[PDB]
Structure 1
Amino acid sequence: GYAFKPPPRPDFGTSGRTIKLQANFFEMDIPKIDIYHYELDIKPEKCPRRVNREIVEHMVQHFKTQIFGDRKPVFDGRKNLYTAMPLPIGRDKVELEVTLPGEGKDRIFKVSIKWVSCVSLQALHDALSGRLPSVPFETIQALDVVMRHLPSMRYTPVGRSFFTASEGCSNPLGGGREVWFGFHQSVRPSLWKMMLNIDVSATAFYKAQPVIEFVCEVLDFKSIEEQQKPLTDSQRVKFTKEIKGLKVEITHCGQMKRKYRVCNVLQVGQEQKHTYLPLEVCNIVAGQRCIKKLTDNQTSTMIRATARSAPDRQEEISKLMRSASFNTDPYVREFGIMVKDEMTDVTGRVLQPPSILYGGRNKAIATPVQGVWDMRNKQFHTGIEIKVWAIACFAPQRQCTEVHLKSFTEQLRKISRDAGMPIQGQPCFCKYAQGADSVEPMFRHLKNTYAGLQLVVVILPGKTPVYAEVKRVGDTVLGMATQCVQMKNVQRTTPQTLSNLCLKINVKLGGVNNILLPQGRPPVFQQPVIFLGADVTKPSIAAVVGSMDAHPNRYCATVRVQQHRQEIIQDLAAMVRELLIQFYKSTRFKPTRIIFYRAGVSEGQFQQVLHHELLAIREACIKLEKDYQPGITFIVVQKRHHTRLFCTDKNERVGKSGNIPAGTTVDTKITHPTEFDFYLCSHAGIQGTSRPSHYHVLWDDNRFSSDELQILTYQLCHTYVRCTRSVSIPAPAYYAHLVAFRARYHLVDKDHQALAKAVQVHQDTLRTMYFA
């Protein structure tokens, strides 16, 4: 039924200079054997995943000769149990009773092992060979979890990651926090091998040491003898918050050991048993995190403990590939899996960054220095005659101050005359309001008093719903376009920092700031073209931005509100109806090429977002004007993945980060062959960072060649408003993120009546922006 699939890729890329890169991939030889599948029905399910792993280890170490023998399984810690060899258990569902011995009451786990399937590895063989259209994910998770279970004992796995132990090292941080610098282990398909994907993770952990030192260090009370007088109930309530939910165990029973469960306060387990453990006998076994409670400065320095440069990331993943030694891993090499520790050789395509045209008096050309360029006193295309405008500071009055607002305004108009704006005069009204209570009479006063008001400036303290109320009022009620600055960019200013604000408020009303070179433009630009971008984000968010003209700066935005915990677009018809009628109003020309975008989508949701975000635009385009179906170039970006690219022996080291140069498209040998995709990194040296941006283009209507698509997408990265810094993701996707957050705030002041009473967006703002 789901025949509305992404098309196969028509042609590989050949443009630009070809580079031989070293990706974040590790070559490995995968055999043709079939991995079997078994299910674990665990009773009870109140125990966590680590307790399940310990009990499965107990029944291999206790019932070796009956279920397994020398053939041994591999384990996914919640339900799944895979094995490369044929286990001697078969169809027989043994409801094995795990008997951990105890003080009278033994810990009884009722687990049943049942054969489910024999997973054919020839399916993934046909997948990476290119003769299958789509790569299966169940078999890629089986190949992932082949290499989990032996490192599951040494590194306690949560999510799809690993949490390393202190291999001869130590780390204190304070407040009961330590960093467990493991790694995000993954495997991704390719052409030749299903090469491994290792990225460092480096998260926090709540250690594996008993609760005496915990009450020594977390409550900062190392001795209770000095605290002779007891405190109030607050330490008891904090004890109830923190101590409950952390598993302890006994060690006062000789060789007989077991693991206990904590649900009451320390009143371990039920109150009807005879095993109660005070603070002097509790021992916490590893595997406990995510129930953390501390201030965020430890989180920030823990983020610093992960923040590593790209050559440092090369050395760290190379050290991890040496020290963990997955070829020396016993059950992995018993499973027929061996890896190649050496970094791969991948063939890529570095791109010439396109020369842009800015208009104005000179109309000369500026070229990017590997994805980055500055205007540097070069006038843009269409400046806008700003005559009357207003300031409505909705921060408290001490923050937005008068002489600093005057110097911000003056340096804004002076750098905007340097960049080519005819800003006429000071703003007429500079009012200093308080908050979300009284937003409406002064907005009515600004609408009725100053006729033809062009822009209103709003100053905000931070994340607060006076912003939410002013955005809802300004884009639904009466209709002035609201641009918002915080004082953190007003108090400290640099010419870049306010030049980019003047070019945000340039396009806020509407105008053209940049145009690509007609010689440098792809042949899509010889026809009219609509650049579209979607975003899914307390009801939830539907928000889509489309452009206005062939000159790629003028856009406009739509907002709707949808039900929560849903990441689909369902009201797309009204959105792109408004976008294409505003295109028709803007240029008197129906655009011929649709360039769709969406930022931040899950990898498994692609067929459903294809189903609801291209059939909806098709039933909208039959509703706008008859015999009008422009070709859609649907590009779905990812921006969060564990797949990196590293420079070839530092041949072209750029920046202090040491990452790869900008535009380095890689489609062969590490990207998925069988579908329509490419990697792209349009970045520079920032913070110490290794990254691409996976532009998995999900639909091309007329099936243009991907050589044109990648250079058009690189240009569209260099058609942002803030194109002064490399924006890495083409412009309507990031506009869509802004307008998505806008729809989010549009409904916070409060079935769907509260939603339906504040969605009637005004006609005086849908021609303008409310997001940049």
Structure 2
Amino acid sequence: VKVARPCRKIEKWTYLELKGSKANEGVPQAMTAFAEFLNRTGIPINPRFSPGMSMSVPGSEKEFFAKVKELMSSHQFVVVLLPRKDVAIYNMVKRAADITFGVHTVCCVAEKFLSTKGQLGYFANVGLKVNLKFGGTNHNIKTPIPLLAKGKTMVVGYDVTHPTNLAAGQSPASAPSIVGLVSTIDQHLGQWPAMVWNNPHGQESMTEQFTDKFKTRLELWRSNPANNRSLPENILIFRDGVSEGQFQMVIKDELPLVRAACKLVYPAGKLPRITLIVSVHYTVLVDEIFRADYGNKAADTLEQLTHDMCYLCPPAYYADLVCDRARIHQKELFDALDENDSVKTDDFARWGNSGAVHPNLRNSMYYI
């Protein structure tokens, strides 16, 4: 199955084999079959990989970084083979690659990567991720609902997660939080660049920051050559992570901040229409787009739109993935939270700074 829009050329890549108790065989042949399958699907990865490195996993994370530094720094892409299904090692590799050295990776368990039976299917899944990491689009929704068709609608998803669990029901409003946000940047809806930020005073910090954060997303859209200095005429916004008791807070305290961002960026008198949707299923909280455009067919036009999303709930799922990966990135913070329920607000903020994705990967789907 050919990808809809091929990513950028992947010219210089290699593998990192992390040794387990039994030695692997046939690794270079598997790497060869891997690149062949990706090409067969229309992903322009160089068939030739640079010779890979094999090493056993060191005792500490600092030792690991020192050992992989040159490999990760000198390639655009590394296929990392784990000795077993091990999310502790995965998470360490992601800190090295996503944060410290800034290189795209796929982590594959060696038994799965190397196994001949079922290999084409596994390589297909991995290849879909690679195509996205490097800027492509996988699936083409060819007959979209009018609203997506025109190439004039931006879709947004965000979630807000609380690193401390106090285990006493819902986190209060002041609890420190981390935001993960994604949005589309073009008509194709393949690419969904992410933003992560920290709210050291919880909702108070969200209120101070969301307008300026959202403004950058509009600016990202406008500066994308594809859109030709255009700003979307519609903005569909999905908020995950709230209970029905918190719907009002989203409408009254968060949405106005998005509106203000639009006021700062748009030509005078040229504001976009906005629809806000939450998920506890999904409930439309504010709608300026669908009733306007579709009268009676409103309900059904959005359910088709969100079904098209499945085919090609992405905004909420992608935003969730962004939050989950942020939790891995901000290791200093989570280590600190194991010792006290509260860390200093200045510490919360600067551990956010320390765990930010490397500029090599800044607008990329590193989280996918």
Give TM-score, length-normalised by structure 2.
0.75
Q: Which residue of 1 aligns with 2:279?
A: 637
| CA apart distance, 1:620 | 2.8
The percent of aligned pairs where both chains have the same amino acid is: 27
Please state if 1:474 is matched with 2:111. Answer: no
CA distance in 2, matches of 1:380, 1:527: 20
Q: Secondary structure at 1:767's aligned position in 2?
A: coil
In the TM superposition, what whole-angstrom CA distance separates every residue of 1:226-264 from its partner, at most 9, and x where no partner exists?
A: xxxxxxxxxxxxxxxxxxxxxxxxxxxxxxxxxxxxxxx
- Provide the secondary structure at the position in 2 that maps to 1:696: strand
Aligned to 1:501: 126
* 1:383 has 2:6 as partner: yes
Decide whether aligned partners of structure 1 residues 573 and 392 sit closer, same or farther in structure 2, where only a CA change above 3 A counts: farther
Q: Secondary structure at the match of 1:515?
A: coil
For each residue in 1:133-182, what CA deviation from the matched residue of structure 2 results, as whole angstroms up to 9, or x when unmatched? xxxxxxxxxxxxxxxxxxxxxxxxxxxxxxxxxxxxxxxxxxxxxxxxxx
Q: Read off the aligned partner of 1:700 and give its amino acid letter.
A: D
Cα deviations by residue, 1:352-385 (Å, 9 ceiling, x for unpaired): xxxxxxxxxxxxxxxxxxxxxxxxx4x2222232
- String of CA shifts for 1:594-653, please: whole Å, max 9, x gaps: 121233421111111223431222233344455464222222123xxxxxxxxxxxxxxx
Residues in 2 aligned to 1:554 and 1:524: alpha-carbon distance in whole angstroms? 14
| Residues matched between the structures, number | 326
Match of 1:584 in 2: 222
Provide closer, same or farther for how the CA distance between residues 575 and 484 of structure 1 changes in structure 2, counting only shifts above 3 A.
farther
* Residues 656-690 of structure 1: per-residue CA shift (max 9 Å, x gap): xxxxxxxxxxxxxxxxxxxxxxxxxxxxxxxxxxx
The residue type paired with residue 698 of structure 1 is: L
Is the contact between residue 3 and residue 137 of structure 2 (CA under 8 Å) also seen in structure 1?
Answer: yes
1:616 equivalent to 2:253? Answer no
1:582 deviates by 2.8
Bigger proportion of residues as helix: 2
Would the aligned equivalents of 1:480 and 1:764 in 2 still touch at CA under 8 Å? yes
1:519-668 mapped onto 2 (5 Å cutoff): 520-537=144-161, 538=163, 540-563=177-200, 571-586=209-224, 587=226, 588=228, 589-624=230-265, 626-627=267-268, 629-638=271-280
Gaps of 5+ in 2: 165-176, 336-343
Query: SS state of the match for residue 553, structure 1?
Result: coil
Structure number with larger C-alpha Rg: 1
CA distance in 1, matches of 2:23, 2:148: 46
CA–CA distance in structure 2, aligned partners of residues 489 and 600 of structure 1: 33
What SS does the corresponding residue of 2:26 show, helix, strand or coil?
Answer: helix
Structure 1 distance, partners of 2:305, 2:252, is: 28
1:445 shift after superposition: 1.8
Match of 1:490 in 2: 113
* Structure 1 position 508, deviation (Å): 0.8
1:425 is aligned to 2:63: no
Contact 1:560 1:759 in 2 (8 A): no
Structure 2: how far apart are the matches of 1:471 and 1:697? 36
Cα distance change of structure 1 residues 757 and 380 upon mapping to structure 2, 3 Å threshold:
closer
The residue correspondences of 1:267-416 to structure 2 (distance < 5 A) are 377=1, 379-384=2-7, 385-393=9-17, 395-398=18-21, 401=24, 403-404=26-27, 406-407=29-30, 409-416=31-38
Q: Secondary structure at the match of 1:523?
A: helix
In structure 2, the partner of 1:742 is: 325
Q: 1:769 to 1:699 in 2, by over 3 A?
A: same
Would the alpha carbon gap of residues 608 and 472 (structure 1) be closer, same or farther in structure 2, given more than 3 Å must change? farther
Instruction: Using structure 1 for the length normalisation, give the TM-score.
Output: 0.38
Q: CA offset at residue 564 of structure 1?
A: 9.5
Q: Name which structure has the greater RCO, CA cutoff 8 Å, separation 6+.
A: 2
Letter in 2 for 1:419: T
The amino acid that maps onto 1:410 is T
Q: Which amino acid aligns with 2:12?
A: V
Secondary structure of the 2:354 match is: coil
Counterpart code for 2:221 = F
Q: CA deviation at 1:768?
A: 1.2
Cα distance change of structure 1 residues 415 and 473 upon mapping to structure 2, 3 Å threshold: closer
